[PDB]
Subunit: 200 residues, 2 copies
C-alpha cells in the first residue's frame, strides 16, 4: 500500500542517514540502521537488502526532489525565474552543509574512478540529470524565454559542474572564502548569456 | 647563484618526485612507502631523507609543482600574447591534454583532497593553496585590465574561484566519463563564454 510503504521507507532511510552521517558509509551496517530506526529487523529487510542500496536510494531521492522543485516552480513562474530562484537559494541552503550527508556522498562518488560498477551507476544518474535539465531548458525555449547558443546537454553539464563546485566550496571553506553568493551570481551570468534569457 | 647549489637541490628534488610519482601511480597514496621511493629513485636512503621525511610531503610537493607549472604557463604565454589569448589557449590545451588523464596522478590527487573536509590540517593546507591560486590568477586578470583588455563586472577573486571550479569540473568529467559524454570541448567553450562576458573581453 504505497503511501504506507513510502512512509516506512522514508523512516528507515532517515535512520540510515543519521547513521551514515555519524559513522560514514563504510562502517555502517544493517544492524546499526535497524537499531536506529526503531523498527523490527524484518521490517527493515523487507524494503532494503543492504546499506549500499539504502545509500544510493538516498542519493536518488535527493536528486529527484531537486528536479521536482525546479519542474514545479516552472509550472508557476518562468523557467528562468525558477532556475534563478534555485541559485539565489544556494547561499542560504548551504550554511550547514558539513552536517548533511553531502560530504559522505561526495567521498562515495570520488572513488568511482576505480570501481566500474559504481562508475556506471554514477553515469546513469548523470545521464538522467542531463536529460531532465535539458527538458526544463527546452520548456523555456518553447515558452519563448531562451534562444541558446550552445547545445542543451552542454549547458546542463556545465550547470551540474558549477552547482557541484558551489556546494564543494561551502564544504571546504568558511563563508567569505567560499563566496557562494558570488559564484551563484557568476552562474546566473553564464546561464543568462548562453540561454539569451532577457527576463529581469 | 649560491655557488649554484639551489639548482642542484632543485634537480635532485625533481628527480625524487619523478620517482615518487611513478610509485604513487602504481600503488596509490596510502600504500606507498619511503623505501619504495628510495628504490625507484636510484638514490641512497640518506639522499632522499635529506629532502623529504615522508611520502605525504612528496605527494603534496607534486600537487604544488603541477599548480605552479599551470600558472607559469599562463603567465609566460601572456608575455607574448594578450591575457585573453593566453587564457583561451589554456582552455584549448586543457581539452587536448585530458586524453589520458586516468593514467596520471589526478584521480589519486582528487581522492586525497576530498577527505580534507574531515582532516583539519589537510583542509588548512588546501586553503593555503587555494588562496595562492586566487591571488595569482587575480594578478593575471589585473594585467589584462592594465592592458585595456577587460572591464570586469564581478570581483577578480570571484572570477578566479569560478574559474578554478569550472577547470576542476572539466578534468573530473574527463576522468569519470568517456570522451563524448564528458564533453570537455563543449565545457571549455562554456568556460570561454563565461569569461568573455564577465571580463567584458572584446577580442576574437
Amino acid at each position: 500500500t504505497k503511501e504506507h510503504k513510502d512512509k516506512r521507507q522514508a523512516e528507515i532511510l532517515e535512520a540510515a542517514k543519521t547513521v551514515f552521517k555519524r559513522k560514514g558509509f563504510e562502517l555502517t551496517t544493517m544492524k546499526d540502521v535497524v537499531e536506529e530506526s526503531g523498527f523490527s529487523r524484518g521490517g527493515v529487510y523487507l524494503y532494503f537488502s543492504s546499506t549500499e542500496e539504502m545509500f544510493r536510494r538516498i542519493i536518488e531521492t535527493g536528486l529527484d526532489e531537486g528536479l521536482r522543485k525546479l519542474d514545479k516552480s516552472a509550472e508557476h513562474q518562468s523557467v528562468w525565474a525558477s532556475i534563478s530562484s534555485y541559485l539565489d537559494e544556494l547561499t542560504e541552503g548551504l550554511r550547514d552543509v558539513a552536517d548533511t550527508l553531502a560530504p559522505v556522498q561526495f567521498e562515495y562518488l570520488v572513488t568511482a574512478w576505480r570501481n566500474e560498477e559504481r562508475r556506471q551507476y554514477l553515469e546513469k544518474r548523470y545521464d538522467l540529470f542531463v536529460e531532465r535539465f535539458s527538458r526544463l531548458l527546452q520548456k523555456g525555449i518553447d515558452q519563448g524565454e531562451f534562444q541558446p547558443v550552445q547545445p542543451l546537454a552542454t549547458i546542463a553539464k556545465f550547470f551540474l559542474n558549477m552547482n557541484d563546485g558551489i556546494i564543494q566550496n561551502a564544504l571546504y571553506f568558511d563563508e567569505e572564502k567560499a563566496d557562494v553568493s558570488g559564484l551563484a551570481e557568476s552562474a546566473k551570468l553564464y546561464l543568462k548569456t548562453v540561454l539569451q534569457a532577457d527576463e529581469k
